Design a protein around this ligand. Structure first.
Ligand SMILES: C[C@@H]1Cn2ncc(-c3ccc(S(=O)(=O)N(C)C)cc3)c2CN1c1ccnc2[nH]ccc12
Lengths: 257, 1009
């Protein structure tokens, strides 16, 4: 009684079978029409999707010669209760029902109207996520720039502070040489240049302090954008999945070929 | 690290005319000096030491000549400025200061390192600081490649040197295609040899009529013969001259049939006159400086029980300790968990194992995860792919799982050592578009950004250093395993498997069949990709037997072998065999052709030191046409922290051994930084400004002596053979369209530029991702090249396009081209296009235009439909004065419209309108009924089956690009589009019926069988 088989899905694509078996338990399966025009069973084992052909000759079916079974149904039903270990090592335990795939609106007008609402909601949430992604990318890049600029400041501060250490080494024995020679105006000159240097270092220290404070603020903004995106991402996938479903139930209900 | 912005200072794009610079003298004093922004460092040092006398302790200062400057660059580097002829505006200073220092250390090495660091865009000194042994060993061990390359390059004195700089631009086969050969008037070419006679530099033409397969020396011989005992003179004087293409730096130095050269081959095909230039070897060979490789600092220094994997009687287990944090809205999620998986390429080796769910606020698991894999059965390329997923189960029984951060780890390291003990992994942001809970295609290794979620892990200890067994031990075990009837039909089924496209379904029955016949398979060597997928990689018995078979496997075609280098084939023996096929059979034409993909597959490589990186590097240093694009492809991706360390270390070794080309590259790099800076100003501080003022700022800044010195007299990054002479400022433009790209016109400075082109026009785009456009024009070249060899003159014009950084690149401006929209103006007819073409090509050459238009139409009609190029319109399609049709802007491909609108349809992006049909039908009233259109339909039906016959290649080219970051190309399912348009699961007759139906449904009938 095939075509009225929860696990039989017809002209379903390999990529569609993949979506339906993604992260499923060993034993999960579905049957479909081969990628030619002939049946292929897809099964989950060891995190992989194994394709098994359903061979046909003289009205008989099976995976290999001899073809023992009368129909595609009898074939599945044997392997639903007995392991594949003989042929080979798991039973066909979890069917992927086409009926369980809910989405219950009766008529074309009702479907069409609902799809229009979903498609609208989908483009709305899409544009929202795309603008969030742009905010996320920009922020992350500016954070990168600030962290490089802070490194550059740290080095500048290191060079400038080494400058003080140098003036401190040289000046000591010259201030002593000028104190003896009573050259108070020259001592004033050495000191004025030293003040000038410490005033510059003081400004460079504040330029970094301000940027480190911008960095703390931008890092927190990033964390928020990340939280806001990790929230939009799963809802958008489902909203897209529903839209694709209402589009499929419309293509099917209407005239085909 | 890399430079944040391309400005003259931090947060300043251009310096004001005069700028105050803080100078830190060696006596400890500080001097505020007013500097001209374009003032060189030698001038600044002269003004400073004069001014230094007016400050205390001036007596402690030595001579101006005993010092040099040091400052903090935008890369946060303390850079010593040895080149005192550099301008202040070109120093890339963080802040305006200079420190006066007496120069110490190795001067030669410091200068080279600065030059390498400038090309890379990252200071070399950052690599020396990297603690990781793999990094340091890679920098050490890669130098034999560099040493061998420079040895081969100077082995043949001036000839081998010239062969590196100007390699032959030849095709892969001398065999002239039947359709091309028929253009030769009695199997022989007419060439025009030009010569600059030494007294007055007067050009002189000598028109020959020689055989197409005549070696360049024979072409020279006939030139001397043109001017019976003359043989002595020609035999002695035919080795003292070389041939060059008129207008560019393309040289005929190797003994290839003249017809095998691409310029000659294009000339035969296009019914154009080949114009060559005769010059002596002496005038070229002298201009060639001898390249010198020097063993770096890091090489001249050291820099500082065993069990088998197989003698371990336990199953693999990994412990997840804790995570530092995750970024989740506590209200919107329930729990968090670490999903893990053991993978061999993109396929799990066992079922994926999750940890228990814990609150987001408490990411502590301290749980051993158990895997269904016996440790001896672990393959060499086995990886742990993990991620931290969130989980919410509010709406129904429907649990919503979302990946937060991911990371991949190599179970064995570069030394074949299995990983043991604790490990801290900094995780990566989940890529845009990826929905899977795991990212197995993603890079291996910790995230360099330590301000990200960090995961602690514990790997088991077995009381010793566990090593993967030796190849002798594996060869042994295979002979144990093998020790534990053809049929004409079975040989037919096998043959059929090998011919299938790389993405087709392999049933478990076909897998068992292929493995059972593994020894017969050596007769059909092309079957190896499908057989390798029939292997059970989680069984050491099958892996061992496969290793033996691949060791003595016959070599396969390079295009078939490139498949074994994608994300699906991680085994070192597989990729080893794959690299040997490229080594022996891949031409320099094909390597240059598939370089994009070859650079890309370097990301899938588990380790930095591998045979592919060695092959590619060897070739990049052996050929500088290869080395120019190898350098740019790697450089364009240095902003991507997922590959920056790998590509950085690769660029270092390359720049360390490429010789003089580094100087030319550095010129291209400094030209590009200026354009990036100029376009950054217009996009920011001048966005909400008038196009008239924008141009006034543009022309003023482009007149600056510092800008002109850098933006004139350098090689084109689109084609190194093309010299970019003096900028023709009057012909430069900011394009009106929103995005506002730069149209730049340079003068070709070639002596005989008039015979090629006198102007080189390049568009500088800053804001859009050019990689998709780059890949499309590449595939289009590869499509046309197949058509020509199969006898089809569907002549498309794929112009040059290069990505030079993150959303920044160059595009060749196609000369004499106009958009349909432009033609339809200067109240419009369906004949406007046909009229324009009838008026731009009068009388005699009217048909030569209509032929060019129809042929290029069919090319584009098939190319666009196969690839699924973004919607075509009057602004995207352009026609040259020739009749040559050209498509612009290929930003989208495959089904880019699948997520936005759920509609499953292979679209016809290029629907030939009435306007277009009229042109083919030469102005007829019933266009579909014509004989002109019949020849068009035929062209398309041929073009399509040609490509469908070569599907395997295109599918591999795309598959090799999965890890690149291209939105439309993120999974093998994205590549399934090409399998639908080429209708691969159908017969060639069915596929062609499908094409015809697609063509009819879009054109509303007319496409007759
Ligand atoms: C630089 C490339 C190639 N190319 N070569 C010539 C032209 C061209 C542009 C405008 C006109 S016109 O409007 O009739 N005019 C004469 C008034 C005629 C020709 C172009 C355009 N083009 C692009 C521009 C933007 N985004 C791109 N993405 C990929 C290619 C590309």
């Amino acid at each position: 009684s095939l075509q009225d088989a929860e696990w039989y899905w017809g002209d379903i694509s390999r990529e569609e079978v993949n979506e339906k078996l993604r992260d499923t338990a060993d034993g999960t399966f579905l049957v479909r029409d081969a990628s030619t025009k002939d049946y292929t069973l897809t099964l989950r084992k060891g995190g992989n999707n194994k394709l098994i052909k359903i061979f046909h000759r003289d009205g008989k079916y099976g995976f290999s010669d001899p073809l023992t079974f009368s129909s595609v149904v009898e074939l599945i039903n044997h392997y639903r209760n007995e392991s594949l270990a003989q042929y080979n090592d798991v039973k066909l335990l979890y069917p992927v029902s086409k009926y369980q795939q809910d989405v219950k609106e009766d008529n074309i007008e009702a479907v069409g109207k609902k799809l229009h609402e979903y498609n609208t909601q989908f483009q709305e949430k899409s544009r929202e996520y795309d603008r969030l992604y742009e905010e996320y990318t920009r922020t992350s890049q500016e954070i990168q720039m600030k962290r490089t600029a802070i490194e550059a400041f740290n080095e500048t501060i290191k060079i400038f502070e080494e400058q003080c250490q140098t003036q401190e080494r040289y000046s000591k024995e010259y201030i002593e040489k000028f104190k003896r020679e009573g050259n108070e105006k020259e001592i004033q000159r050495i000191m004025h240049n030293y003040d000038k240097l410490k005033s510059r270092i003081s400004e460079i220290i504040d330029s970094r302090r301000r940027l480190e404070e911008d960095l703390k603020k931008q890092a927190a903004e990033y964390r928020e954008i990340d939280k806001r995106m990790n929230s939009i991402k799963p809802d958008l996938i489902q909203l897209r999945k529903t839209r694709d479903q209402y589009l499929m139930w419309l293509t099917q209900k209407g005239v085909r070929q | 690290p890399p430079r944040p912005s391309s400005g003259e200072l931090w947060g300043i794009h251009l310096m004001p005319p005069r700028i105050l610079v803080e100078c830190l003298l060696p006596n400890g004093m500080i001097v505020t000096l007013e500097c001209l922004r374009e003032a060189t460092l030698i001038t600044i040092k002269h003004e400073l030491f004069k001014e230094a006398r007016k400050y205390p302790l001036h007596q402690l200062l030595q001579d101006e000549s005993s010092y040099i400057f040091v400052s903090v660059t935008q890369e946060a580097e303390r850079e010593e400025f040895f080149d005192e002829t550099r301008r202040l505006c070109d120093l890339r200073l963080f802040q305006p200061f200079l420190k006066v220092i007496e120069p110490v250390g190795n001067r030669e090495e410091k200068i080279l390192n600065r030059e390498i660091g400038f090309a890379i865009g990252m200071p070399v000194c950052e690599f020396d600081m990297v603690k990781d042994p793999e990094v340091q060993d890679f920098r050490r061990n890669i130098l034999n490649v560099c040493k061998e390359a420079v040895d081969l390059r100077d082995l043949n004195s001036p000839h081998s040197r010239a062969m590196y700089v100007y390699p032959p631009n030849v095709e892969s086969s001398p065999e002239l295609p039947k359709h091309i050969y028929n253009k030769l008037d009695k199997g022989q070419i007419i060439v025009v040899i030009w010569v600059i006679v030494s007294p007055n530099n007067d050009k002189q033409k000598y028109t020959l009529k020689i055989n197409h397969d005549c070696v360049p020396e024979q072409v020279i011989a006939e030139a001397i013969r043109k001017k019976e005992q003359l043989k002595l003179c020609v035999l002695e004087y035919q080795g003292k001259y070389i041939l060059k293409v008129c207008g560019c730096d393309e040289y005929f130095l190797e003994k290839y049939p003249l017809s095998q050269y691409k310029y000659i081959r294009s000339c035969i095909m296009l019914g154009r006159m080949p114009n060559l230039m005769l010059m002596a070897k002496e005038s070229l060979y002298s201009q060639l400086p001898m390249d010198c490789f020097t063993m770096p600092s890091y090489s001249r220094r050291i820099s500082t029980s065993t069990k088998s994997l197989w003698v371990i009687n336990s199953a693999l287990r990994i412990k997840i300790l804790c995570a530092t944090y995750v970024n989740v809205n506590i209200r919107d999620i329930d729990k968090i968990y670490v999903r893990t998986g053991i993978y061999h390429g993109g396929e799990p080796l066992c079922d994926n194992v999750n940890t228990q769910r814990v609150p987001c606020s408490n990411p502590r698991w301290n749980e051993w995860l158990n895997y269904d894999i016996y440790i001896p059965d672990l393959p060499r390329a086995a990886r742990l792919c993990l991620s931290i997923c969130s989980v919410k189960g509010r709406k129904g029984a429907k649990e919503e799982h979302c990946p937060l951060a991911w990371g991949n780890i190599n179970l064995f390291d570069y030394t074949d050592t299995l990983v043991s003990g604790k490990m801290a992994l900094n995780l990566w942001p989940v890529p845009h578009g990826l929905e899977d809970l795991l990212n197995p295609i993603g890079v291996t290794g910790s995230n360099p950004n330590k301000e990200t979620p960090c995961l602690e892990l514990e790997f088991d200890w077995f009381s010793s250093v566990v090593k993967f067994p030796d190849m002798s031990v594996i060869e042994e075990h295979a002979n144990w395993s093998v020790s534990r009837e053809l049929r004409e039909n079975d040989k037919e089924q096998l043959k059929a498997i090998s011919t299938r496209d790389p993405l087709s379904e392999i049933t478990e029955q076909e897998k068992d069949f292929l493995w059972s016949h593994r020894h017969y398979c050596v007769t059909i060597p092309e079957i190896l990709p499908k057989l390798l997928l029939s292997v059970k990689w989680n069984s050491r018995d099958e892996v061992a037997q496969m290793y033996c078979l691949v060791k003595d496997w016959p070599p396969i075609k390079p295009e078939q072998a490139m498949e074994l280098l994608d994300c699906n084939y991680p085994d070192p023996m597989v990729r080893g065999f794959a690299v040997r096929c490229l080594e022996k059979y891949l031409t320099d034409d094909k390597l240059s052709q598939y370089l994009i993909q070859l650079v890309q597959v370097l990301k899938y490589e588990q380790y930095l030191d591998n045979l592919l990186v060695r092959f590619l590097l060897k070739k990049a240093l052996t050929n500088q046409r290869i080395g120019h694009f190898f350098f740019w492809h790697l450089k364009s991706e240095m902003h991507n922290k997922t590959v920056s360390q790998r590509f950085g270390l690769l660029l270092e070794s390359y720049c360390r051994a490429c010789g003089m080309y580094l100087k030319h590259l550095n010129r291209q790099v400094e030209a590009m930084e200026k354009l990036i800076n100029l376009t950054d100003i217009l996009k920011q501080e001048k966005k909400d400004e008038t196009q008239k003022v924008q141009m006034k700022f543009l022309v003023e800044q482009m007149r600056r002596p510092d800008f002109m010195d850098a933006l004139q007299g350098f090689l084109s990054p689109l084609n190194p053979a093309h010299q970019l002479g003096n900028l023709r400022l009057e012909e430069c433009e900011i394009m009106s369209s929103a995005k506002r790209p730069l149209k730049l016109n340079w003068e070709n400075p070639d002596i005989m530029s008039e015979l090629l082109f006198q102007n080189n026009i390049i568009m500088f785009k800053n804001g859009d991702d050019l990689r998709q456009d780059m890949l499309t024009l590449q595939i289009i070249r590869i499509m046309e090249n197949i058509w020509q060899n199969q006898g089809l003159d569907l002549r498309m014009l794929p112009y040059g396009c290069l990505s030079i950084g993150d959303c920044v690149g160059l595009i060749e401006w196609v000369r004499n081209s106009h958009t349909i929209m432009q033609i339809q103006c200067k109240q419009f007819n369906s004949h406007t296009l046909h009229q324009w073409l009838k008026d731009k090509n009068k009388g005699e050459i009217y048909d030569a235009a209509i032929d060019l238009f129809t042929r290029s139409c069919a090319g584009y009609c098939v190319a666009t439909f196969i690839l699924g190029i973004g919607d075509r319109h009057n602004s995207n399609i352009m026609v040259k004065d020739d009749g040559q049709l050209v498509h612009i802007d290929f930003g989208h491909f495959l089904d880019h419209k699948k997520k936005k609108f759920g509609y499953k349809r292979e679209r016809v992006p290029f629907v030939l309108t009435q306007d277009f049909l009229i042109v083919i039908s030469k102005g007829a009233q019933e266009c579909t009924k014509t004989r002109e259109f019949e020849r068009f339909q035929e062209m398309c039906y041929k073009a399509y089956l040609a490509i469908r016959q070569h599907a395997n290649l295109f599918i591999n080219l795309f598959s090799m690009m999965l890890g690149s970051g291209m939105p439309e190309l993120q999974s093998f399912d994205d590549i399934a589009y090409i399998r639908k348009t080429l209708a691969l699961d159908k017969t060639e007759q069915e596929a062609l019926e499908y094409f015809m139906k697609q063509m009819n449904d879009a054109h509303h009938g007319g496409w007759t069988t």
